[PDB]
């Protein structure tokens, strides 16, 4: 794939209750594009969690540079554990969809 976004860390483990923040970095070439945050449900069915531009427990925040983005689940629950990714959709010039590698979130029990 050409100029895909990266999604990090590949493995993020948090205690239930905390916030969990991923970093999706996309260096866009010509800004007619949208970024989407996905969670992969049973046997590869994708669920859209949020999208930039535009549940409130899933927040996407654009950082000062034109590359880095913060995707955070607020107060992660045990069943937030799963597989996530970010996809970049360039609308023009020349339509193209590029996904990141999959990252795993693990939410552990509080003591």
């Amino acid at each position: 794939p050409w100029n895909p976004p990266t999604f990090s860390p590949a493995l993020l483990v948090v205690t239930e209750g905390d916030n969990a923040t991923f970093t999706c970095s996309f260096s866009n070439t010509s800004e007619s594009f949208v970024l989407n945050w996905y969670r992969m449900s049973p046997s590869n069915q994708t669920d859209k969690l949020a999208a930039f531009p535009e549940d409130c427990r899933f927040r996407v925040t654009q950082l000062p540079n034109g590359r880095d983005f913060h995707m955070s689940v607020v107060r992660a629950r045990r069943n937030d554990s799963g597989t996530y990714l970010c996809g970049a959709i360039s609308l023009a010039p020349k339509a193209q969809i590029k996904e990141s590698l999959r990252a795993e979130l693990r939410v552990t029990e509080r003591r």
Partner: antibody
Amino acid sequence: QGQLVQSGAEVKKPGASVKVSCKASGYTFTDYEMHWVRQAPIHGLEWIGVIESETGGTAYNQKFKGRVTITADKSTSTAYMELSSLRSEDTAVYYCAREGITTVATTYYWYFDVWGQGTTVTVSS
Amino acid sequence: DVVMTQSPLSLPVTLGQPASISCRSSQSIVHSNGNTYLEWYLQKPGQSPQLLIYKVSNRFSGVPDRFSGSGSGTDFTLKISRVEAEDVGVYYCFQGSHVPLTFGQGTKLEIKR
């Protein structure tokens, strides 16, 4: 391949709005983007904008950005195109045209392999 | 915006003879991925435009052998080896490497009688 059928001719007063549709058949709708292109003698062929059906994302030519809205209904394989604040110079033929979305499974090197038949919009008092 | 200029604007040609249309871009139209999305479209009279040539020199499916494209930098050319009757209409070059996407102004190919 596949097909694109657009709504019939339209006539509107200066300052009104028009909404023209574009129905797809014979191919997978979400595998493609839908562009809109204008053709008039004073203007030639000019690109208006594009929509990606799945995300609803749109990109517009700065010339029309602010008075054009492009929408798509994936369930009915129909794209739409709404021009507001019509001027006499908006009189033209309006085409919709698909573009293959490059993915990791498929690469598209071309833009407009299938076009609608065109929709005539006349703006006059 | 990248301005695409065609030459000539009217092309009368005798049946069986070659034809040539020039397209010039006001700047480079190399895409950020390295590809040059220069295209040639033909609008037969009373019909919609149809794709002839993609990516500077690649012939689209169903397009006859006699059509060919070439170019480099800002200069591109469409060649017809032997003009046939079904080849009349308006020819447009198009660039898709920069937003906004722009077409040339058109070249009307007519039969010289």
